[PDB]
Amino acid sequence: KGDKKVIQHLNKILGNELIAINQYFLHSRMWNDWGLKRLGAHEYHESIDEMKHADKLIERILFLEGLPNLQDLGKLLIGENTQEMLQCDLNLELKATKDLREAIVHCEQVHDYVSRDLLKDILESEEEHIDYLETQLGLIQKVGLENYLQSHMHED
Amino acid sequence: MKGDKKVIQHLNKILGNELIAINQYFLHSRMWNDWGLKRLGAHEYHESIDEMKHADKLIERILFLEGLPNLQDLGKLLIGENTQEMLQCDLNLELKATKDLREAIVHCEQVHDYVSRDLLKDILESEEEHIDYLETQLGLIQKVGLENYLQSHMHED
Amino acid sequence: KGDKKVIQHLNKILGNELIAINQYFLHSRMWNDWGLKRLGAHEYHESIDEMKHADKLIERILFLEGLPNLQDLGKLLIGENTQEMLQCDLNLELKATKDLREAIVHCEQVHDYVSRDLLKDILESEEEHIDYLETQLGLIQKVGLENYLQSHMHE
Amino acid sequence: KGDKKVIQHLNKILGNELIAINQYFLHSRMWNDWGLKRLGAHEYHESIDEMKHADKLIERILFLEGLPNLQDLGKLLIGENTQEMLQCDLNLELKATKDLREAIVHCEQVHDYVSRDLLKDILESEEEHIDYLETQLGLIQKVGLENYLQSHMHE
Amino acid sequence: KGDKKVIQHLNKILGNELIAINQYFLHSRMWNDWGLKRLGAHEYHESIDEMKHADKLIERILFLEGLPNLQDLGKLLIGENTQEMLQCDLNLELKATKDLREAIVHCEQVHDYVSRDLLKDILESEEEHIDYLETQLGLIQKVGLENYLQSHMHE
Amino acid sequence: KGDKKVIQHLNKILGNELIAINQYFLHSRMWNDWGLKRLGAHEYHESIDEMKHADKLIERILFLEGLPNLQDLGKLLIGENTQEMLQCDLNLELKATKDLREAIVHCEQVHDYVSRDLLKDILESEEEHIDYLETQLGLIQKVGLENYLQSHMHE
Amino acid sequence: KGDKKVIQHLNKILGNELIAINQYFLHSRMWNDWGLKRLGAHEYHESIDEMKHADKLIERILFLEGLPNLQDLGKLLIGENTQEMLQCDLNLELKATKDLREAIVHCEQVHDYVSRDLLKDILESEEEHIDYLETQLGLIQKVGLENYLQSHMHE
Ligand code: HEM
Ligand code: HEM
Ligand code: HEM
Ligand SMILES: [K+]
Ligand SMILES: [K+]
């Protein structure tokens, strides 16, 4: 019933969300470990958001009578300090966003407009995340790394 | 520096088992929902959430002990194709998890990591509760027949 | 001081309650084990009711100056499946109820009208239990074993 | 699923709990009969606690695929006055505690860590009871028997 | 029209209530006089309860078309210290309870089941009071009279 | 009666807690003096936590019929600046935690599973304390000492 | 900077409070162990009060640029029964109170009127403590030791 390449696209986006869930979750727990609790909580909330996207992808694939793939897990990008963690998340999101545009082009072409609408809602969320990530990296330049980390020791 | 290395390897192994379980239970949940078996869908969803909570505690402990949590390696999901197989797959998964937990606890005891032991014991209790639930559902399928069992799980509450 | 045979009757009724406590408590936990939670909860309340009747019997025996006998525990009738368990409970209650009638006769004869009244209240409760049991057995015939068990999975 | 000697240990601890349930329940009603209502209420809660321990044991045994034994009831130690009743409870709890330790040794050996944990929680609660018991007997010595009883007349 | 001998029995139980009202009332105010206020309050409440039994007997006699007798007051057993006051109440209750069993035999025999039920409720109450009285006498022995009285100074 | 070596081990853990109580309290008060109020409040909570541990140890020793030793006070590790204070706290907890492991091995050996459980709960809280301390020292490196102290001026 | 001798005196009072904290805490816990819960609770409150005094002394020393001494712990006076425990507490407070007077004279002399005021507040609370202690010892004589202990069993 679903278009076969729409389902391949939905699984591919799903594969991206599955990487992100784990990467964000680890980076969150690394920040907590280091006592940078505000970064930790924020990253924890990014990880939950990716879990909610994966749910919606999984529900759609199953309705389209595809088989969701949660077995393949691509490469986690894990940073070694706060700057690299944030850059690692940004590299993940730039790739996820590219795959999202490509999935949407194809849904349009086979008139799977509901799948298209779902991917656009994810894409808007991923662009907000890009903005958060770029912004954090800019603040590191503007206030200095030590100040930036200080401002993230204590939770909101 | 602080953690025993084999404790860490044990913890990453349990964590690996939790990560399979998260994905397996989450897909079985959504498969059950897709079929309109909503009470099963919701119960399996809560099993998946509980495994996510246990992964979180293991990750925090690994990191305290100065090890590196492994979330990169995902072992084999046991995906069933109908209700009876999905339950059995979950049970086969738990029986392996539970064996692994016992071996870890043995080792924690040996090297005096009594806090890690205690965490693993709480997870074990919780996995043994799951085994009870799983075995009970399979026994009920026998006692009330599959059609009734499935009917009793169409609606939530 | 109570009539000595009244006390022996009170101790016999208590002996029956003590069997029922343990038999119903085990049947309750067997049903919970099997995922038949409504049967398990009902059977648990029947066990608690037998505990309360044992308590009244103990209090009365002590007031009458007798020795409550909590030591001798008779035979538990344990079933291996739902129909057997309900039938065992019924067999137990049919025996308890005969003992209650015999005891009441004796309290009447020696003018122990308070013990009689106490035993009549337990008898009413036991007859309502017989009714519940006979009814479950009937429902099993009417709706079929698998339906009947299905109806007792969720609390 | 269960290890067979784990199950025998669980049934033995269960057996000890069945004795304590009855012994404390009777001691409770005996204190009440005498108008020592505060000892009565205390002992009633000790009995209820042992009922909850038995429940947890039954459920564990059934999950491990054993047969809970509620049929065998060992010897109740019943005292004839307050000093002896407290000593009988203490002697019962010293033996309980010893069996709980041997059972935990065995769970540990065959890696039944959940059964071990359950028995350790029971043990903590039996050691609290030993403390209450030892303490009442020391109070009998410190304040005198008549005072001690007087302090236990009113709830 | 009631049975004649039913009515005679009801008026007899009523005379026992009228003695008891006045004896418990006086014992209460003697206790209050001495500053044993807990005994005084408890005894007040026993007196009020006898008043309520008397009222039920009066109503029933009048419904059966008899004449209630409140003129013939029997012998009050008034003690001169706590121990005697309590034994007096208990001597009065043993008699009351015996007259009660007789009335009930007679009601059974002429089929006055409602009068019988009324007398049985009173008998249960009178047996509770026997329990209280025997308990108190027991306590004086176990805790010593001085302690027993001290425990009844404050309400 | 407890095992003699368990009481020595409990007394040794107690000894460690008595040192920590005083060392944490003084560091707390030194932080408040310098106007580093958040550090002062955190450290006061740590000192309070050790006071609670000490209390449980004391209750347990006495139950076991031992004599709690509150007389021997070991050596306080008092730093003179924030970095040294934190490291002295960590040096203390490293020793405390080693001693707790050795106690727990002995308790397991002689089957004192309640003592073991108590010590394990204290160990888990001491380990959480080590985490806090290692984390703050690391934050000093990541944010710089001046920013780290500034972040602990206000509560 | 405070006067050097005032800091020595504050450190000496502090020293007394550290002894009292531990001595009162242990007596508290010994009373709870024996089931004299009211004495145990009162004594715990006394130990807490000394902890608050110690805190104020510590804050004041540091303000005055001195070094609080929490390392030297003088000699605990631990009794072995209730009467001795009370007298050991009074023996402690008699010394503490003498030392506080000598401190206050010195503070007055060098014009440290805030220190003096702090010490006077501690002296008033130590004097209230002496009153409590002398009162309990007198009550032991007036009511007898058995009644006195009985009056302190329940909180
Ligand atoms: C590293 C693997 C994962 C970890 C460590 C993890 C952890 C967590 C935690 C701690 C929570 C909050 C649980 C609570 O306390 O209520 C949560 C929620 C949730 N998770 Fe995961 N999770 C993981 C993977 C997944 C995956 C693969 C999915 C795929 C569907 C998923 C779906 C969800 C959903 C839907 C929620 C509820 C979110 C909400 O609405 O609040 N999670 N997870
Ligand atoms: C196999 C032996 C027994 C078991 C397993 C058992 C189990 C239980 C349980 C689980 C409860 C509820 C307690 C709570 O959580 O609050 C209870 C209550 C109680 N039991 Fe038992 N019980 C047993 C025997 C007895 C016996 C022999 C007596 C005799 C008097 C008794 C008298 C009572 C009473 C009066 C209550 C409170 C009932 C109420 O709610 O009014 N029990 N029991
Ligand atoms: C220099 C030594 C000590 C200092 C400065 C100190 C100070 C304090 C303070 C200020 C409090 C809070 C009191 C309140 O606000 O009501 C407290 C509470 C407490 N202290 Fe200590 N104390 C000391 C020694 C001890 C010791 C040796 C013990 C051993 C048992 C102890 C046991 C406790 C307990 C159980 C509490 C109540 C904690 C709670 O809230 O649960 N104290 N202490
Ligand atoms: K700054
Ligand atoms: K007295």
Curated annotation (Swiss-Prot), chains C, D, E, F, G:
Cofactor: heme b
Name of the protein this chain belongs to: Bacterioferritin BfrB
PANTHER family, sorted: BACTERIOFERRITIN
Cofactor note: Each BfrB homodimer binds 1 heme group coordinated by an axial ligand from each subunit.
Transmembrane segments: none
Recorded consequence of changing D33F: About 30% active in Fe(2+) oxidation and storage, diiron-binding site does not coordinate fully, decreased overall flexibility of the BFR, partially occludes B-pores, see Fe ion inside the B-pore
Organism whose genome encodes this protein: Pseudomonas aeruginosa (strain ATCC 15692 / DSM 22644 / CIP 104116 / JCM 14847 / LMG 12228 / 1C / PRS 101 / PAO1)
Location of this chain's protein in the cell: Cytoplasm
UniProt: Fe(2+) Fe2 binding residues: E50, E93, E126, H129
The encoding gene: bfrB
Effect of Q150L: About 70% active in Fe(2+) oxidation and storage, diiron-binding site does not coordinate fully, loss of bound K(+)
Phenotype when the gene is knocked out: No growth phenotype in iron-sufficient conditions, cells do not store detectable iron under any conditions tested, cells secrete less pyoverdin siderophore and deplete iron from the medium slowly. Very low amounts of FtnA-only BFR complexes accumulate in vivo at low O(2) levels.
